[PDB]
Design a protein around this motif. Structure first.
Motif, PDB file in Angstrom:
ATOM      1  N   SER A   1      -7.665  -3.438   4.869  1.00 43.18           N
ATOM      2  CA  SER A   1      -6.607  -4.000   5.444  1.00 43.18           C
ATOM      3  C   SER A   1      -6.088  -3.558   6.701  1.00 43.18           C
TER       4      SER A   1
ATOM      5  N   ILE B   1       0.764  -1.174  -0.029  1.00 34.88           N
ATOM      6  CA  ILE B   1      -0.003   0.225  -0.024  1.00 34.88           C
ATOM      7  C   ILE B   1       0.919   1.366   0.051  1.00 34.88           C
TER       8      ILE B   1
ATOM      9  N   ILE C   1      -8.615   2.214   3.413  1.00 36.53           N
ATOM     10  CA  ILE C   1      -8.020   0.752   3.025  1.00 36.53           C
ATOM     11  C   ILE C   1      -8.417  -0.009   3.989  1.00 36.53           C
TER      12      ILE C   1
ATOM     13  N   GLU D   1      -7.009   7.571   1.202  1.00 33.16           N
ATOM     14  CA  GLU D   1      -7.678   6.281   0.701  1.00 33.16           C
ATOM     15  C   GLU D   1      -8.091   5.644   1.902  1.00 33.16           C
TER      16      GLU D   1
END
Ligand code: GDS
Ligand code: GDS
Ligand code: CL
Ligand code: CL
Lengths: 222, 221
Positions: B133, A132, B131, B129
């Protein structure tokens, strides 16, 4: 326990935190035996280790010179050994003083500001289950911000508190040496000249170089 | 601009400044809250960075000690308790073994609870963002933090010294804030000893009063 050193220091070789305690023990001429707790094998979650630290994270210390007193949290470990054993106050501020609490403030910045955020940079770079970039960037920028805070102080004074190297300065060393390998095109001396000089001066001390060389040996290809 | 012993600079939504207010209340020390609005980037203002070069709230000025300035919420608490809790009502005696156990627990709060709870909030609400996870990682870490507390508190009433101290108090603000970020979470069911300990402290008027002040401030833009 089956050694004759004053301290048992339980640490994971790759971690910044145990070696920090080792630096301070060396500075104070206190004997210690390293007991490796292998995080790669999840040994930090073993019943044996969790009896020492219910958090199940390294490091932990047993002071055999104080009725096997057990203490964890690397910064608290450092404070305990400095307060009790740095009788001549070579690397620590006197208890009770304003300077003691400023020394404490800087160790909390190390423990709560440098450590966890450096650790998240490493986590998202190497260990998170997916890559990420926005997360890696978040913590890369935070690492650089931490350096800027140190630079803002160290460009104006030699040491964080009390006019000399203390446990406050020493506490940043291991993570600062580790982190440079996770930053983009990073020239420590170029980007943060005062912080780099401070870091490298400390790292040249044999009391700090010896344990750090031992870490390198333990992690090297055998 | 005020006659109180302390100026406490904090951001209303933060866990950290209110923690210091709880301790000030416990010790009957007078203080004035000075808001530093993080929503407006005031923590990076020249004035505030002069108080704290890290540019993060909170910070303290002790007007009873030559305008002594100190930051890091846990260091602020230690300073206040060591210097002013002379009767040791809610703190361990400096120098003693128990002082270092008290310190260990405050470092667990400052390095373990705070930053990880903070990342849960960050990835839930504020990261550009979304996310999943990352949210999952910090949800699970928050639950793990509770499990550590439970391992201890299920076997003893307080973290150190057989009494409520700054070590126990330090977890309160974040433990109230975090539950809204956890799914299907019944604190008492999941961690009964930790829940009872937390709720007992939150009921104290010394803690409830500043926490109600937080609510009041939160309700107004
Ligand atoms: N505040 C504490 C921090 C202590 C701490 O961070 N301990 C680490 C040292 S190992 S070093 C840091 C460690 N790295 C890893 O867990 C990666 C291990 C890799 N998968 C391998 O196989 O070697 C980690 O915890 N990364 C995640 C993060 O920092 O958030 C630890 O025990 N971690 C094990 C655990 O949490 O179970 C202190 O200062 O004492
Ligand atoms: N170890 C320090 C921690 C101090 C700390 O975390 N201060 C926060 C309190 S504001 S609260 C936490 C803050 N939240 C935000 O930045 C979102 C703020 C939202 N928009 C609002 O208006 O409330 C934050 O830092 N989230 C990211 C994270 O925790 O890593 C702060 O000043 N943050 C401003 C900054 O860093 O510039 C202590 O204990 O004193
Ligand atoms: Cl370690
Ligand atoms: Cl705050």
């Amino acid at each position: 326990a089956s050694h004759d050193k004053q301290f048992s220091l339980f640490l994971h070789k790759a971690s910044a935190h145990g070696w920090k305690v080792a630096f301070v023990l060396e500075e104070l001429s206190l004997s210690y035996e390293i007991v490796l707790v292998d995080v790669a094998k999840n040994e930090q979650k073993s019943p044996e280790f969790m009896k020492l630290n219910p958090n199940g994270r390294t490091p932990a210390l047993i002071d055999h010179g104080n009725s096997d007193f057990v203490i964890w949290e690397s910064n608290a470990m450092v404070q305990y050994v400095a307060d009790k054993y740095d009788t001549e106050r070579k690397i620590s501020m006197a208890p009770g003083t304003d300077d003691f609490y400023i020394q404490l403030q800087w160790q909390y910045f190390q423990g709560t500001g440098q450590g966890p955020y450096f650790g998240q940079l490493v986590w998202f770079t190497l260990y998170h289950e997916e890559k990420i970039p926005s997360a890696v960037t978040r913590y890369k920028e935070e690492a650089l911000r931490v350096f800027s805070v140190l630079e803002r102080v160290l460009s104006n004074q030699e040491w964080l508190v009390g006019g000399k190297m203390t446990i406050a300065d020493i506490s940043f060393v291991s993570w600062n040496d580790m982190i440079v390998h996770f930053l983009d095109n990073f020239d420590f001396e170029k980007e943060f000249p005062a912080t780099a000089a401070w870091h490298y001066k400390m790292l040249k001390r044999p009391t700090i170089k010896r344990p750090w060389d031992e870490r390198r040996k333990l992690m090297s290809r055998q």
